[PDB]
Design a protein around this ligand. Structure first.
Ligand code: HI6
Ligand code: HI6
Ligand code: NAG
Ligand code: NAG
Lengths: 533, 539
């Protein structure tokens, strides 16, 4: 019995497992419970802390993935499959994973906490792309990741009700955050240096912990990759949540208490079966059950709160990939497929715009078309395709990121911004997709260092640079190597100069303006256009 | 006659003319200046369509320029050559309607293709007798026959109570048409070829050329057309019948006045009282808007220019159109607070927003914001230098470049052969400041070949340049193609097409071909902005 794999937290004793990372061993403790299983009558409710346990809990295996939709679009395609749950689905899924250096760090080590994305309708902390051994081994990080309820289970809300208050998904997260506070010191972790990082819906989640006071005592720095609390997709009004919760309850056979009661009787697959039939329009990049502006967790819209927050003792690193939009086009936009080259007609392009910006008025959609049309090549199908991609990425990720960076820096936060520009040599999608949403993650988490993964060698070198920025960021709130001249340096994003770096195989290059003209359209003009229908 | 010079006496349908032997740098030209082509539109004829000139007796002396049409004189920079060059240079008068002719000396053997110049001046000023419109050079160096006419500007030429008998509107255009007819009847006596007539004009003249293209009765009077920095479509060249009626009425009031009885009173007003007041009838504080312009009468203009270019057939037509680099800088200096010819005009964001409301006076609050949004550089939204130049572009794009782009597009698509250019050379002898770039109106002097006059102090490259321009222009008059048929070594000037949207740059360097006339930005003005209207409260 290896005493390096024996740990004692407030709940009892855990045995982890020793794992091989290319250049060493790591202690790993997987499937640690941090909540009483949110099942039966617990469904839709705030999580309660796990009761203590006898003996030695076996923590050497990933626990069950929270009950969620599973993608069938491209059945057995590596590209969509890598996101799909890789353990058994179950409502009983409130477990978290810790990775540490083996042997347990001697001095308290910065803690990175990873929040998976997945549209607020999917995701699990057990996917290979979230494998923490590399950062633990190479950078001596203590790295934590948790599961949190998704879909109806995590985000169905009857605002005001006692039994479905909304936001329980984020409460699951918050609870895991408390747990890290209360227990991480025992794995060598420094509860006084906790950096959250997450991607997409996970970046939004991190964003919400920033914007919710009770969360703020639980971490010190945040990294939002390719997602924001602000923007078109990450929240809903309490009215629109009440509307969808009712619609779904009608859809499956069901005053508040009585209604939530009946939903509690339905098998999980029945809710997931109808989850997606409640979107107001035919959308892409728009999700049925998401964090709701409840005036509790969120006291006001994210935009309200980022416009008026005080963020002085905050450091944030934020970023996007070169081709945020491409991924989403094959999931709802006619003319787009991973198998051809998705060259489209002017017609399909106007069609694609009413879907990407599903909430647009006729005139607003015309404006989008006019802005993205290349009037030298107004009918060229390569441009039309590439443009469609940008409309979707810009609207949902890039511009919301630009706005978040700008509002944070202006209100005292220290901000670093990036754009990730390297396309994996191992990528299973077509070239026209560029560098799609989600494919920086494998690099940040250090996957290329696993030789059997068939990544090139410059990619392994690149992976180490990233692990370095991210972990430096976690140590110090500055991604720059603290000793090591000549880089050049990664400057803080500011409203004045608007600088951010490209992350690719070449050295850091500083650029100014994150699609500034185009984002002015989305962040400034577009909203006036509609606030006058 | 008897002792006279035999090569200077010509007969026209009106009677006998004695012209004058002018000196050009390379030799003599024949000039016939101040030939009357209409009855004096005076007294009871004020506001009325020109009546053809009754024949006279004896030999009419045609050796000097005649009167300039009664007009407002600009006094922003009193004494400054940059503004005085445009000011009237012969006496002001309602007896006004005269044209000029320059021909080689002696006159051409075979019939020579004719150029007709139509001056601009906002439809409230201009004269064919200005030095920059001197046809002595094109006549001498290219062998061209050049004609230019005075036409009524301001109230006298454009005040209208649409529908009425006594002030139908557009009579300034009719002065112009009457002179084209005159060229048809008479240009043969000078060696002109009535079957080869090319109109060209600038700014408001350009728009007039445009309106002859769009008006059936004018079409039989010319064959090709050049529009320099102006179009018939666009926000300033025309007004609705209602707007024209409203401006006419207001102006009547301001000077103390059933249409008949109202016009009668207008006809008793001294010309100067009308000039002193015309500028007050504008609806908003604005730049690049003029009180009295062609009205859409359902007559000279059957429909709006926008409508007519969007439909008409233009198979028979060849057209050359273009713009200067900095169309709008000239205009800021007149009426946008922050701007001057005497400092660098660095402005603030506030002054920019203010300037947009003035430069785009018809704009609802939203449309104006759309403009500021498009033109702001969001990396440096506060930068005085960037703002200064953006304000210039806003005015230049809204008034010349995008209407011109619009027009090239529609004409090309409707079977016209179109050639387009942007003129990018700043005259070495310009009295405006560098910030203004190459301003509105300052290519004219190169097209007319003034730099060939050694006394004018242009550079040698500038002399060679001007001749190049004169070749393109005359070649175009001649053949409907600016390109030199002989010298095909030097780069060629492609037609502008819907597809490739090719135009050339005119500067000291040889032709360079470019694609897209401010294409992204003109999509905003020509497509989005209209739709963005979809509001009720302005006017
Ligand atoms: N519950 C939902 O809102 C929802 C939304 C979208 N989808 C399907 O996902 C399409 N998609 C799948 C993978 C990546 C992006 C987009 C299922 C459920
Ligand atoms: N009566 C008029 O329409 C009018 C309009 C504008 N201006 C302005 O003169 C300034 N200005 C002078 C020359 C060129 C443009 C602007 C005078 C009269
Ligand atoms: C940069 C600068 O000095 N601008 C001034 C401007 O404020 C003033 O209104 C104008 C009139 O004199 O001349 C100029
Ligand atoms: C041009 O140059 C001469 C000699 O330097 C000068 O006297 C004259 O006034 C100048 N004329 C013009 C038109 O600039």
């Amino acid at each position: 019995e290896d005493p390096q794999l024996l740990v004692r937290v407030r709940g009892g004793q855990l045995r982890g497992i020793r794992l091989k990372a290319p250049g060493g061993p790591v202690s790993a403790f997987l499937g640690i419970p941090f909540a009483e299983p949110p099942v039966g009558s617990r469904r839709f409710m705030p999580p309660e802390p796990k009761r203590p346990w006898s003996g030695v809990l076996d923590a050497t295996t990933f626990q069950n993935v929270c009950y969620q939709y599973v993608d069938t679009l491209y059945p057995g395609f590596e590209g969509t499959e890598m996101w799909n749950p890789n353990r058994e689905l179950s409502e009983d899924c409130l477990y978290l994973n810790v990775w540490t250096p083996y042997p347990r760090p001697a001095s308290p080590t910065p803690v990175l906490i990873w929040i998976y994305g997945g549209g607020f309708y999917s995701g699990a902390a057990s996917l290979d792309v979230y494998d923490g051994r590399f950062l633990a081994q190479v950078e001596g990080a203590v790295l934590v990741s948790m599961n949190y309820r998704v879909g109806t289970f995590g985000f169905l809300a009857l605002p005001g009700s006692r039994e479905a208050p909304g936001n329980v998904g984020l409460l699951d997260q918050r609870l895991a955050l408390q747990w890290v506070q209360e227990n991480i010191a025992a794995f060598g972790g420094d509860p006084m240096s906790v950096t959250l990082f997450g991607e997409s819906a996970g970046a939004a989640s991190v964003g919400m912990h920033i914007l919710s006071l009770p969360s703020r005592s639980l971490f010190h720095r945040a990294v939002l990759q390719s997602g924001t609390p602000n923007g078109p997709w990450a929240t809903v009004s309490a009215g629109e949540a009440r509307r969808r919760a009712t619609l779904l309850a009608r859809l499956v056979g069901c005053n508040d208490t009585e209604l939530i009661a009946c939903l509690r009787t339905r098998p999980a697959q029945d809710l997931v079966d109808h989850e997606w039939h409640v979107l107001p329009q035919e959308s892409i990049f728009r999700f049925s059950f998401v964090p709701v502006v409840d005036g509790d967790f969120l006291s006001d819209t994210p935009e309200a709160l980022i416009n008026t927050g005080d963020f002085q003792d905050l450091q944030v690193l934020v970023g996007v990939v070169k081709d945020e939009g491409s991924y989403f086009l094959v999931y709802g936009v006619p003319g787009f497929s991973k198998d051809n080259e998705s060259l489209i007609s002017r017609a399909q392009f106007l069609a694609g715009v009413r879907i990407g910006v599903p909430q647009a008025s006729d005139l607003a959609a015309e404006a989008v078309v006019l802005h993205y049309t290349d009037w030298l090549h107004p009918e060229d199908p390569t441009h039309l395709r590439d443009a469609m991609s940008a409309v979707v990425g810009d609207h949902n990720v890039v511009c919301p990121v630009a706005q978040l960076a700008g509002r944070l820096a202006a209100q005292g936060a220290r901000v670093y911004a990036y754009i990730f520009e390297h396309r994996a040599s191992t990528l299973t999608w077509p070239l026209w997709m560029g560098v799609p949403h989600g494919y920086e993650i494998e690099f940040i988490f250090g996957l290329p260092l696993d030789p059997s993964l068939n990544y090139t060698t410059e990619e392994r070198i690149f992976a180490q640079r990233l692990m370095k920025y991210w972990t430096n960021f976690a140590r110090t709130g500055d991604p720059n190597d603290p000793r090591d001249s000549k880089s050049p340096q990664w400057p803080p994003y500011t409203t004045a100069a608007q600088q951010y770096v490209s992350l690719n195989l070449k050295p850091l290059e500083v650029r100014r303006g994150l699609r500034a003209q185009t984002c002015a359209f989305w962040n400034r003009f577009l909203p006036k256009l509609l606030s006058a229908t």
